[PDB]
Amino acid sequence: SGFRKMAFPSGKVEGCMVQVTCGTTTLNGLWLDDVVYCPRHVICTSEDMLNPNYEDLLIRKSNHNFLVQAGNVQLRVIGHSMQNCVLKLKVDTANPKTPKYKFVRIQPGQTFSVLACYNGSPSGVYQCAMRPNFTIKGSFLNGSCGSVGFNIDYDCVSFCYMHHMELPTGVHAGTDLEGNFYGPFVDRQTAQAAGTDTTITVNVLAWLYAAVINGDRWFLNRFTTTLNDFNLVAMKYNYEPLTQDHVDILGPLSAQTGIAVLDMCASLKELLQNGMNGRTILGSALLEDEFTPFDVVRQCSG
Amino acid sequence: SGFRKMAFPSGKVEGCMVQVTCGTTTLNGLWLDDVVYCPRHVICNPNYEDLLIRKSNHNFLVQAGNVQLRVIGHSMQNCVLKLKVDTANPKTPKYKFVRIQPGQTFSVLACYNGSPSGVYQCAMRPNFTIKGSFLNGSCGSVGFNIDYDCVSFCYMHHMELPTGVHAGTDLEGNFYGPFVDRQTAQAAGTDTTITVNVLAWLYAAVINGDRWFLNRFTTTLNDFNLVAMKYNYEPLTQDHVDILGPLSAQTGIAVLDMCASLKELLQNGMNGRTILGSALLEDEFTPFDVVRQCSGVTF
Ligand SMILES: C[C@@H]1CCN(S(=O)(=O)N2Cc3ccc(Cl)cc3[C@H](C(=O)Nc3cncc4ccccc34)C2)C1
Numbered sequence: 224s225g226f227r228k229m230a231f232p233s234g235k236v237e238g239c240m241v242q243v244t245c246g247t248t249t250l251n252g253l254w255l256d257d258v259v260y261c262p263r264h265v266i267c268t269s270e271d272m273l274n275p276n277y278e279d280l281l282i283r284k285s286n287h288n289f290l291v292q293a294g295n296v297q298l299r300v301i302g303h304s305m306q307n308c309v310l311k312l313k314v315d316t317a318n319p320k321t322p323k324y325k326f327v328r329i330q331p332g333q334t335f336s337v338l339a340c341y342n343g344s345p346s347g348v349y350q351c352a353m354r355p356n357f358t359i360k361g362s363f364l365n366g367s368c369g370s371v372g373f374n375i376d377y378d379c380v381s382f383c384y385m386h387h388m389e390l391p392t393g394v395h396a397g398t399d400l401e402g403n404f405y406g407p408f409v410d411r412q413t414a415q416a417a418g419t420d421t422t423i424t425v426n427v428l429a430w431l432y433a434a435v436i437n438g439d440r441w442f443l444n445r446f447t448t449t450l451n452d453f454n455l456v457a458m459k460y461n462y463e464p465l466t467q468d469h470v471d472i473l474g475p476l477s478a479q480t481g482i483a484v485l486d487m488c489a490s491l492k493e494l495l496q497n498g499m500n501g502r503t504i505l506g507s508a509l510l511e512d513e514f515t516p517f518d519v520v521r522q523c524s525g
Numbered sequence: 526s527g528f529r530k531m532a533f534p535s536g537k538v539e540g541c542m543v544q545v546t547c548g549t550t551t552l553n554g555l556w557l558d559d560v561v562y563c564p565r566h567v568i569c570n571p572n573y574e575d576l577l578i579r580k581s582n583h584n585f586l587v588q589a590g591n592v593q594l595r596v597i598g599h600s601m602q603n604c605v606l607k608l609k610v611d612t613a614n615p616k617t618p619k620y621k622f623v624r625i626q627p628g629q630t631f632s633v634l635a636c637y638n639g640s641p642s643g644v645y646q647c648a649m650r651p652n653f654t655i656k657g658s659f660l661n662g663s664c665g666s667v668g669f670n671i672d673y674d675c676v677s678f679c680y681m682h683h684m685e686l687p688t689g690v691h692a693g694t695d696l697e698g699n700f701y702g703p704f705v706d707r708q709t710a711q712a713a714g715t716d717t718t719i720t721v722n723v724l725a726w727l728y729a730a731v732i733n734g735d736r737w738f739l740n741r742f743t744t745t746l747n748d749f750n751l752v753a754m755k756y757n758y759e760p761l762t763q764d765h766v767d768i769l770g771p772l773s774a775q776t777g778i779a780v781l782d783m784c785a786s787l788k789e790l791l792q793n794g795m796n797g798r799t800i801l802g803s804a805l806l807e808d809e810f811t812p813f814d815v816v817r818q819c820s821g822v823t824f
């Protein structure tokens with residue numbers, strides 16, 4: 224029993240965190256085999272950030288301009304290349320602690336663990352989600368750039384996020400491990416702002432199924448709804464549209480609890496209308512959207 | 526910016542998790558140097574001295590990854606079984622066994638069959654239970670804090686109570702709370718809110734740019750405690766006020782000034798507003814957790 228926002232054990236990722244320094248800038252790198260991956264803005268000054276020409280700034284650098292530190296050991300840089308918004312530093316030592324891994328690009332609504340680091344040293348681990356507006360509501364300070372997001376289903380670490388920047392509203396933007404940004408963001412200090420955020424509907428529904436599994440049914444009603452009527456209502460509360468794919472994905476939880484997806488949708492419709500009236504659901508007074516259908520099955524069942 | 530329920534990096538603890546089997550019961554063990562620590566109920570009104578005397582070393586099957594550790598001795602300390610093994614754990618970190626007080630927080634590495642599955646942050650409730658997330662097979666999972674490079678082990682999971690909350694011991698086998706390790710009628714006492722922790726989280730909200738709850742008012746410590754007793758909040762002591770000093774100086778809001786804001790939130794609610802994305806007053810961040818997360822302390 225119990226339901227917690229649970230992160231993956233961070234050990235496999237801790238053994239990859241290094242510090243990368245170029246001139247006055249110091250940030251985090253991910254050391255996998257003989258390559259260190261880090262945000263390409265490590266080659267920029269604060270001035271450069273307005274309109275940086277990364278190809279021009281990079282061509283002026285040599286291998287010895289990049290200082291890479293793994294614990295108390297300096298790694299030697301023997302090559303460098305840029306792939307989108309990530310700098311790849313070839314080093315002379317393969318990481319002996321390299322876990323089994325994959326680089327995966329996630330979609331909005333997907334969750335992952337973040338190992339927040341400063342000066343190549345891990346300070347904490349937390350669970351979060353890729354928001355529909357492609358930002359993440361993280362907890363990051365100056366120097367956290369290069370911290371990574373991941374999942375560890377089985378013994379394979381799937382790296383899905385690398386931290387690059389903090390937006391004006393305090394939310395965060397970054398790339399997959401191939402350097403492609405999530406969202407319409409650029410690694411440039413420009414007037415860019417997060418789009419209006421919405422609630423991840425399929426995730427709230429999954430969390431309502433988690434409450435049922437844990438013994439809570441107070442929010443259920445005798446009603447059902449069509450998918451289209453549900454979407455017309457949910458859109459008015461800034462909820463993401465629920466697609467047929469979402470309904471399919473919720474099938475296992477629907478079968479385990481005996482509550483049809485569209486009957487759970489009717490309960491969500493009523494919660495949006497009435498609020499909770501002094502009650503909580505799994506210890507929360509708000510509708511939680513940072514647990515996917517997959518996370519619910521993983522935690523409530525094993 | 527941002528404020529998350531953050532756990533310590535679990536790596537130093539992952540390298541210590543093993544699977545312990547005795548007969549039909551399988552649970553988790555903590556392998557430090559040449560000893561494996563685990564709940565004594567793995568041998569299971571039980572007379573533990575009588576159940577233990579009937580066991581030999583080879584009755585305990587200890588597995589570290591894909592390797593079997595041979596048990597060469599066994600002894601009991603309170604509600605923890607200590608299994609002497611032939612091999613010292615080469616991944617043993619620098620560590621201490623510490624007993625925590627209610628209100629203190631820690632990270633839990635939840636394991637099943639000696640394999641870590643997740644990490645989460647939680648607090649020792651004033652009623653000595655923890656609101657964790659555990660299933661059958663989670664027994665022996667541990668709670669810890671990291672200070673510098675030293676892992677301070679403070680909790681070992683033993684059981685779930687009827688309300689879905691959890692009970693366990695420190696690493697010396699002494700239970701937190703009036704609980705015993707057996708199938709008997711047990712229940713968590715009436716819980717209270719950790720006041721010093723809510724105040725710390727209110728200081729964290731001010732640091733992150735949320736000030737709607739601040740007011741021009743102050744209060745005496747005694748008047749605040751009279752209001753706190755009415756709302757099932759733990760009494761705030763002068764020690765709590767001292768501990769909140771750094772956060773008070775960083776934000777320019779006196780502790781009793783922040784107490785007056787808390788008094789108003791308890792008496793009137795949040796009125797459709799949230800604080801750090803929460804419609805409830807959060808009490809599982811200590812003053813030290815707030816300073817550490819708003820400063821970036823690394824391990
Ligand atoms: C919120 C401030 C406002 C201006 N900057 S900054 O620190 O000068 N800045 C600009 C900038 C622009 C583009 C890119 Cl790709 C990176 C960056 C850097 C950045 O975003 N780094 C940070 C990443 N995460 C949390 C941060 C928290 C507090 C500071 C900085 C953080 C540096 C951010």
Ligand SMILES: C[C@@H]1CCN(S(=O)(=O)N2Cc3ccc(Cl)cc3[C@H](C(=O)Nc3cncc4ccccc34)C2)C1
Binds near residue numbers: 660685705707709
């Ligand atoms: C809540 C159930 C009700 C009955 N039992 S049990 O599973 O039969 N049971 C008896 C028992 C008695 C004394 C001690 Cl010290 C430990 C235990 C065990 C226990 O508490 N283990 C669990 C620990 N955490 C989460 C668990 C989740 C689901 C099952 C079990 C869990 C097993 C607990």
Ligand SMILES: [Cl-]
Binds near residue numbers: 328329330333
């Ligand atoms: Cl995805």
